[PDB]
Write a protein that binds this ligand. Sequence first.
Ligand SMILES: [Cu+2]
Ligand SMILES: [Cu+2]
Ligand SMILES: [Cu+2]
Ligand SMILES: [Cu+2]
Ligand SMILES: [Cu+2]
Ligand SMILES: [Cu+2]
Lengths: 98, 98, 98, 98, 99, 95
Amino acid sequence: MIQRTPKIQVYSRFPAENGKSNFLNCYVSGFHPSDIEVDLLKNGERIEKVEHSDLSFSKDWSFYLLYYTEFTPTEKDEYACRVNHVTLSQPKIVKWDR
Amino acid sequence: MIQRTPKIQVYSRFPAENGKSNFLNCYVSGFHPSDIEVDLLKNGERIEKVEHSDLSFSKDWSFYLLYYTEFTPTEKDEYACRVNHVTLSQPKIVKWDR
Amino acid sequence: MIQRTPKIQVYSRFPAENGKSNFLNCYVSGFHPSDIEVDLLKNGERIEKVEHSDLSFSKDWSFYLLYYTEFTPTEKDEYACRVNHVTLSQPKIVKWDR
Amino acid sequence: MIQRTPKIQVYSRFPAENGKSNFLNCYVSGFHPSDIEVDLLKNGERIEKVEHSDLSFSKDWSFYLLYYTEFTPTEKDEYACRVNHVTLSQPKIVKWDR
Amino acid sequence: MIQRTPKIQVYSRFPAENGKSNFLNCYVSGFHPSDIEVDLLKNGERIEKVEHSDLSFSKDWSFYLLYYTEFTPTEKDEYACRVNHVTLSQPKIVKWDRD
Amino acid sequence: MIQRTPKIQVYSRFPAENGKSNFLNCYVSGFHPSDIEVDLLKNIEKVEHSDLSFSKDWSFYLLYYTEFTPTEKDEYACRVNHVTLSQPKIVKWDR
Ligand SMILES: [Cu+2]
Ligand SMILES: [Cu+2]
Ligand SMILES: [Cu+2]
Ligand SMILES: [Cu+2]
Ligand SMILES: [Cu+2]
Ligand SMILES: [Cu+2]
């Protein structure tokens, strides 16, 4: 039907605590989930044990989907969500801000 | 990772009882659910208010998915599940066991 | 109120890929889940750690229920679902294909 | 294996407020849910639109199950849960204590 | 707007059988869940590995909530649910009875 | 054991569609829920919420949502009232 770039929300489950355990969420929405790739990055490197919800979709194949992993944020640690999709020339990276 | 033609299971939620209300299930599993289109048919005619579960998938984009609708079985009526996919040249229709 | 023999669907979570991990499903429906015994068989022999959903039922005690186990399909192994019920004089064994 | 009169807990979803919408719960547990009949009573009379969870059970067919309905409590009304079971000659009735 | 003493239900997941594994439930309901403390006690001792459901609430902040733990009942072991709340001057303890 | 101002995420369920139906999400997380007031604003009653999730130290998270059809000149926001905040904190939706 229509081609649009996927939108990314990056936030933590509980508010950020340095040292104390948490979860990092990446909520991805858009059209046509044609083998979409989603990664969570720890200082630019892929995080191994990431999990995801089932993919939700409607009749026109608009979709949403949640990726998450258990983590403990620290001082010199930055996190991001990377998405690869057919509408994108280059993978989009969204920084987590806490 | 592999191009395979999707597999379809067609069964009723409860044992098929003439007249009495029930649900008809279509379980679809395969690889790469690229805008896959699933319909439930009443005597070869597409049923309006069909519902589906979220789509489940794994790393290689193998998937499964459930389509269902409320219906009352009778002797005259014939039910089927129709699936359209880029792997299929003709839409694959699977007849209901009961 | 009405007496019927239980109905069995046997299918894999994802399409069968040899040497790679999957789940085997047995969907059972019928009337009166009176202490019903369901087993999954690997080459005639009962699989140890099988799991099941909660039992769903309606006013007339028609029911449905899902049994499942993690398994890796091989070309030599044969899988089946076995059901014991008061309605059956013989335990019903339905083989899995594909 | 064993046979026991089923156990019954009757409580309200939220703390009782006379004239404010609420839910009434009946939690039933026991062994061998052989077509168990559970009713919620308004002044000793069956309530028409009661709902239930799926039935949970373990290997030995011990079970638990929740029955519930929307209700609005008043000072002039008595609510109860009635259970019919193969172990009971008289239907067991437990009055709501709030 | 109004506040009362929270209500506690203590029951086992399955009917109690000695030696056999089970779960112990504590269902708590009331008004204003303001940092409510719930413990399950084994012989007057706080059980460490307890779990809880999410807290459910409505517009007026009436709430309900389920606490539970896996246990194997024995003839002599006493179980109870203890709740601390700003409405309660003394901690309220509800003992578990099998019937 | 630590009084902190709550964090807010405002996003739509599906991508923003002018004239078509969607859901608006407000994800709130903080410490000590204690009778927290969350509203969704249009320039809205029948808002819904998930159960409240919490851990031992009473850190919490919670989701508020409502159905809607966005158009051109419609402004949506999430407003939160808490004992930490002197004034109700409002976070706008940017799509
Ligand atoms: Cu499109
Ligand atoms: Cu492939
Ligand atoms: Cu019958
Ligand atoms: Cu028994
Ligand atoms: Cu109050
Ligand atoms: Cu604090």
